[PDB]
Design an enzyme around this catalytic site. Sequence first.
Site, PDB file in Angstrom:
ATOM      1  N   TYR B 155      -5.032  -3.417  -7.877  1.00  0.00           N
ATOM      2  CA  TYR B 155      -4.111  -2.991  -6.815  1.00  0.00           C
ATOM      3  C   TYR B 155      -2.807  -3.784  -6.866  1.00  0.00           C
ATOM      4  O   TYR B 155      -1.744  -3.256  -6.512  1.00  0.00           O
ATOM      5  CB  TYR B 155      -4.789  -3.051  -5.442  1.00  0.00           C
ATOM      6  CG  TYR B 155      -4.129  -2.180  -4.385  1.00  0.00           C
ATOM      7  CD1 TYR B 155      -3.998  -0.792  -4.564  1.00  0.00           C
ATOM      8  CD2 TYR B 155      -3.633  -2.751  -3.203  1.00  0.00           C
ATOM      9  CE1 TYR B 155      -3.400   0.003  -3.587  1.00  0.00           C
ATOM     10  CE2 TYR B 155      -3.027  -1.964  -2.224  1.00  0.00           C
ATOM     11  CZ  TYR B 155      -2.918  -0.593  -2.426  1.00  0.00           C
ATOM     12  OH  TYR B 155      -2.335   0.199  -1.465  1.00  0.00           O
ATOM     13  N   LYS B 162       1.674  -3.830   0.550  1.00  0.00           N
ATOM     14  CA  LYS B 162       0.962  -3.473   1.792  1.00  0.00           C
ATOM     15  C   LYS B 162       0.921  -4.628   2.795  1.00  0.00           C
ATOM     16  O   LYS B 162       0.964  -4.400   4.004  1.00  0.00           O
ATOM     17  CB  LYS B 162      -0.457  -2.958   1.498  1.00  0.00           C
ATOM     18  CG  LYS B 162      -0.483  -1.554   0.861  1.00  0.00           C
ATOM     19  CD  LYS B 162       0.125  -0.455   1.741  1.00  0.00           C
ATOM     20  CE  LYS B 162      -0.218   0.937   1.167  1.00  0.00           C
ATOM     21  NZ  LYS B 162       0.437   2.059   1.915  1.00  0.00           N
TER      22      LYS B 162
HETATM   23  N1  NAD Z   1      -5.683   7.353  -1.528  1.00  0.00           N
HETATM   24  C1  NAD Z   1      -6.197   6.178  -1.107  1.00  0.00           C
HETATM   25  O1  NAD Z   1      -7.175   5.635  -1.629  1.00  0.00           O
HETATM   26  C2  NAD Z   1      -5.531   5.479   0.069  1.00  0.00           C
HETATM   27  C3  NAD Z   1      -6.207   4.403   0.741  1.00  0.00           C
HETATM   28  C4  NAD Z   1      -5.497   3.595   1.661  1.00  0.00           C
HETATM   29  C5  NAD Z   1      -4.166   3.848   1.889  1.00  0.00           C
HETATM   30  N2  NAD Z   1      -3.452   4.900   1.238  1.00  0.00           N
HETATM   31  C6  NAD Z   1      -2.025   5.095   1.547  1.00  0.00           C
HETATM   32  O2  NAD Z   1      -1.809   6.420   2.108  1.00  0.00           O
HETATM   33  C7  NAD Z   1      -0.466   6.876   1.911  1.00  0.00           C
HETATM   34  C8  NAD Z   1      -0.528   8.276   1.363  1.00  0.00           C
HETATM   35  O3  NAD Z   1      -1.031   8.246   0.033  1.00  0.00           O
HETATM   36  P1  NAD Z   1      -2.029   9.386  -0.478  1.00  0.00           P
HETATM   37  O4  NAD Z   1      -3.226   8.760  -0.992  1.00  0.00           O
HETATM   38  O5  NAD Z   1      -2.160  10.490   0.527  1.00  0.00           O
HETATM   39  O6  NAD Z   1      -1.316   9.899  -1.797  1.00  0.00           O
HETATM   40  P2  NAD Z   1      -0.245  11.059  -2.093  1.00  0.00           P
HETATM   41  O7  NAD Z   1       0.187  10.850  -3.493  1.00  0.00           O
HETATM   42  O8  NAD Z   1      -0.690  12.385  -1.633  1.00  0.00           O
HETATM   43  O9  NAD Z   1       0.940  10.674  -1.102  1.00  0.00           O
HETATM   44  C9  NAD Z   1       1.838   9.567  -1.392  1.00  0.00           C
HETATM   45  C10 NAD Z   1       3.161  10.088  -0.819  1.00  0.00           C
HETATM   46  O10 NAD Z   1       4.172   9.051  -1.001  1.00  0.00           O
HETATM   47  C11 NAD Z   1       5.354   9.797  -1.233  1.00  0.00           C
HETATM   48  N3  NAD Z   1       6.451   9.073  -1.881  1.00  0.00           N
HETATM   49  C12 NAD Z   1       6.474   8.337  -3.026  1.00  0.00           C
HETATM   50  N4  NAD Z   1       7.714   7.864  -3.260  1.00  0.00           N
HETATM   51  C13 NAD Z   1       8.440   8.348  -2.212  1.00  0.00           C
HETATM   52  C14 NAD Z   1       9.835   8.174  -1.916  1.00  0.00           C
HETATM   53  N5  NAD Z   1      10.616   7.475  -2.702  1.00  0.00           N
HETATM   54  N6  NAD Z   1      10.356   8.767  -0.792  1.00  0.00           N
HETATM   55  C15 NAD Z   1       9.572   9.511   0.056  1.00  0.00           C
HETATM   56  N7  NAD Z   1       8.245   9.687  -0.201  1.00  0.00           N
HETATM   57  C16 NAD Z   1       7.668   9.109  -1.337  1.00  0.00           C
HETATM   58  C17 NAD Z   1       4.918  10.859  -2.244  1.00  0.00           C
HETATM   59  O11 NAD Z   1       5.796  11.976  -2.431  1.00  0.00           O
HETATM   60  C18 NAD Z   1       3.652  11.369  -1.573  1.00  0.00           C
HETATM   61  O12 NAD Z   1       3.930  12.483  -0.717  1.00  0.00           O
HETATM   62  C19 NAD Z   1       0.122   5.751   1.058  1.00  0.00           C
HETATM   63  O13 NAD Z   1       0.790   4.775   1.905  1.00  0.00           O
HETATM   64  C20 NAD Z   1      -1.089   5.065   0.417  1.00  0.00           C
HETATM   65  O14 NAD Z   1      -0.858   3.724  -0.026  1.00  0.00           O
HETATM   66  C21 NAD Z   1      -4.148   5.751   0.297  1.00  0.00           C
HETATM   67  C1  1JT Z   2      -8.506  -1.678  -5.686  1.00  0.00           C
HETATM   68  O1  1JT Z   2      -7.627  -0.836  -6.440  1.00  0.00           O
HETATM   69  C2  1JT Z   2      -7.182   0.315  -5.839  1.00  0.00           C
HETATM   70  C3  1JT Z   2      -7.646   0.771  -4.608  1.00  0.00           C
HETATM   71  C4  1JT Z   2      -7.100   1.917  -4.056  1.00  0.00           C
HETATM   72  C5  1JT Z   2      -6.094   2.618  -4.702  1.00  0.00           C
HETATM   73  C6  1JT Z   2      -5.490   3.857  -4.076  1.00  0.00           C
HETATM   74  N1  1JT Z   2      -4.173   3.615  -3.476  1.00  0.00           N
HETATM   75  C7  1JT Z   2      -3.901   3.243  -2.195  1.00  0.00           C
HETATM   76  N2  1JT Z   2      -2.622   3.088  -1.945  1.00  0.00           N
HETATM   77  C8  1JT Z   2      -1.997   3.389  -3.155  1.00  0.00           C
HETATM   78  C9  1JT Z   2      -0.645   3.435  -3.491  1.00  0.00           C
HETATM   79  C10 1JT Z   2      -0.249   3.809  -4.783  1.00  0.00           C
HETATM   80  C11 1JT Z   2      -1.229   4.102  -5.757  1.00  0.00           C
HETATM   81  C12 1JT Z   2      -2.581   4.057  -5.411  1.00  0.00           C
HETATM   82  C13 1JT Z   2      -2.949   3.713  -4.121  1.00  0.00           C
HETATM   83  C14 1JT Z   2      -0.846   4.432  -7.179  1.00  0.00           C
HETATM   84  C15 1JT Z   2       0.555   4.989  -7.319  1.00  0.00           C
HETATM   85  C16 1JT Z   2       1.576   4.145  -6.571  1.00  0.00           C
HETATM   86  C17 1JT Z   2       1.223   3.988  -5.079  1.00  0.00           C
HETATM   87  C18 1JT Z   2      -5.654   2.148  -5.939  1.00  0.00           C
HETATM   88  C19 1JT Z   2      -6.189   1.006  -6.534  1.00  0.00           C
HETATM   89  C20 1JT Z   2      -5.733   0.559  -7.903  1.00  0.00           C
END
Ligand code: NAD
Ligand code: 1JT
Lengths: 259, 259
Positions: B155, B162
């Site tokens: 990560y 974060k």
């Molecule tokens: N997927 C997971 O495991 C998980 C777990 C915890 C937290 N999150 C967080 O949830 C949020 C949403 O991610 P997600 O998993 O739904 O993935 P996702 O890829 O669907 O969404 C990520 C979003 O970030 C937007 N983005 C990236 N660069 C941008 C920019 N310059 N301007 C405006 N928007 C931009 C992308 O267009 C996209 O819509 C993020 O903050 C991510 O870190 C995801």
């Molecule tokens: C413990 O490792 C992980 C645990 C959860 C994740 C999922 N995830 C959550 N927030 C994210 C933001 C980004 C990515 C993956 C992300 C990738 C593209 C850029 C933004 C990724 C790793 C690697």
Amino acid sequence: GFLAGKKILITGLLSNKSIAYGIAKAMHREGAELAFTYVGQFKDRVEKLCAEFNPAAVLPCDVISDQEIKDLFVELGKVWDGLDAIVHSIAFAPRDQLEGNFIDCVTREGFSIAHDISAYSFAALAKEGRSMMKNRNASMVALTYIGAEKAMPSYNTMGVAKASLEATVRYTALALGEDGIKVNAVSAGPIKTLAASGISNFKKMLDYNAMVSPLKKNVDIMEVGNTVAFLCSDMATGITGEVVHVDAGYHCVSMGNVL
Amino acid sequence: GFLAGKKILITGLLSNKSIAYGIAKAMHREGAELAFTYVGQFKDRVEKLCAEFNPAAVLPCDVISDQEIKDLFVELGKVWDGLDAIVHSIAFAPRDQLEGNFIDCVTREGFSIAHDISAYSFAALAKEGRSMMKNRNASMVALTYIGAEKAMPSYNTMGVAKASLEATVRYTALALGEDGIKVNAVSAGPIKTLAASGISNFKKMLDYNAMVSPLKKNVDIMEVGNTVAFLCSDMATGITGEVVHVDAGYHCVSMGNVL
Ligand SMILES: NC(=O)c1ccc[n+]([C@@H]2O[C@H](COP(=O)([O-])OP(=O)(O)OC[C@H]3O[C@@H](n4cnc5c(N)ncnc54)[C@H](O)[C@@H]3O)[C@@H](O)[C@H]2O)c1
Ligand SMILES: COc1ccc(Cn2cnc3cc4c(cc32)CCCC4)cc1C
Ligand SMILES: NC(=O)c1ccc[n+]([C@@H]2O[C@H](COP(=O)([O-])OP(=O)(O)OC[C@H]3O[C@@H](n4cnc5c(N)ncnc54)[C@H](O)[C@@H]3O)[C@@H](O)[C@H]2O)c1
Ligand SMILES: COc1ccc(Cn2cnc3cc4c(cc32)CCCC4)cc1C
Ligand code: NA
């Protein structure tokens, strides 16, 4: 309502100022079927108070007694085929534990009683309620306070007991999660309930909270109740072992502008 | 619905697997009026995705740009007289920042970009949205991850970003509370979204979460969405500067029985 048809036991309703009263109002509004407990002497007072919530049962339960906790679930099981949630809104420490210097005031028996009623009793209810709560996305919520996390004036033995309660909540979340039961706590900001009435400068703690908190107010039993209600809903099924502060943001600040 | 009539801006909708998609579904169900943003090339894709929510606006916003953020609120201000909530569901770090050893991989530019898009953008939305959100029990919610709190493999720079985001949430809660705006984050368990697609072993992280978490399951976008929805409601007005974990209890355990 988001709790429609859910069967929920609420402990700790003592007056219309009780946190459990706010919990009851929120849960009744959201369609829950409610039951209530009381400590012996308060039977009449509590019966009258909870009548507005159309309770399925109003039953005695002094949590000092293993037998009364056992008999609570026997009696509840005669009215309900299963149980969706238990709300723990119970605390006690002998008066002499609170106020004054912690080390001056703390006693072995005081510490023991505070932990027994304020912390062990959560595990006790979980132990005896578990069989009714199996495999129905069931819930438990305990009420706690930031004195669990930080040393504070006056709160003394109760702070230590709340730390024990918060750990009990985490170990209970682990223990019951296999049965789909989620287990959380709400850390409320101070509220002028009957619990406050022993505390000489309580209003001053309220004043400080309203000054220093981001939201510049004191919370109320509905803000607390609505959060407890949410934590017993199907919406909250990804949340367990968590402490959610309902304290106008008090937990997140330090010092502030007014020293 | 508990968001009836509330005007809410949702960022980060990119596919029907997005966390922002689950948020939109939950908020639409609860009667919210919704608007959406997209980054440059994705206009048509996002339009198609949010059509089912009858959006009031679908507007460009690449959060690298102060001007685009300013013009977002100018345009939103033309359809809406006030704004109830902003949902921040945006993250980015360059590919080379993730996976591998943190010290091997981290770079000055990667670190800066990650923080700009993943953390600063939250304050930037607050700065430009504040005037529309004044004095109406308004809300902001950011999405975060436990990698903010703990060192985790892969990560890497995102974990650092974060942690910056979570502090930004706390400072924003403090800065906006005087205007009645509550400001919180939801810390989600791993979910297979587009953000996950670049990550080699993602399925194994999911497998681990389902094994070790108290609830023995992976969370879904509806569990996350419903919690974000709650945090934009009048029920949550006692809650600010808080991080709520929606992770099946992953955050509260250590080691587990299966080593
Ligand atoms: N997927 C997971 O495991 C998980 C777990 C915890 C937290 N999150 C967080 O949830 C949020 C949403 O991610 P997600 O998993 O739904 O993935 P996702 O890829 O669907 O969404 C990520 C979003 O970030 C937007 N983005 C990236 N660069 C941008 C920019 N310059 N301007 C405006 N928007 C931009 C992308 O267009 C996209 O819509 C993020 O903050 C991510 O870190 C995801
Ligand atoms: C413990 O490792 C992980 C645990 C959860 C994740 C999922 N995830 C959550 N927030 C994210 C933001 C980004 C990515 C993956 C992300 C990738 C593209 C850029 C933004 C990724 C790793 C690697
Ligand atoms: N009032 C506050 O400022 C505040 C802040 C944070 C947390 N809390 C917590 O909320 C809970 C409810 O307190 P409240 O403020 O509504 O006060 P309250 O006095 O209305 O309720 C406390 C309840 O504990 C019950 N109780 C005490 N000993 C008991 C026993 N042996 N068996 C069964 N029940 C017993 C009392 O009968 C009462 O119903 C407590 O856990 C308290 O620590 C209160
Ligand atoms: C910072 O100090 C305080 C902050 C909040 C409070 C209110 N309060 C919260 N939980 C409590 C439990 C008890 C009492 C008071 C309590 C009294 C009877 C026994 C159980 C009290 C003090 C002293
Ligand atoms: Na519609």
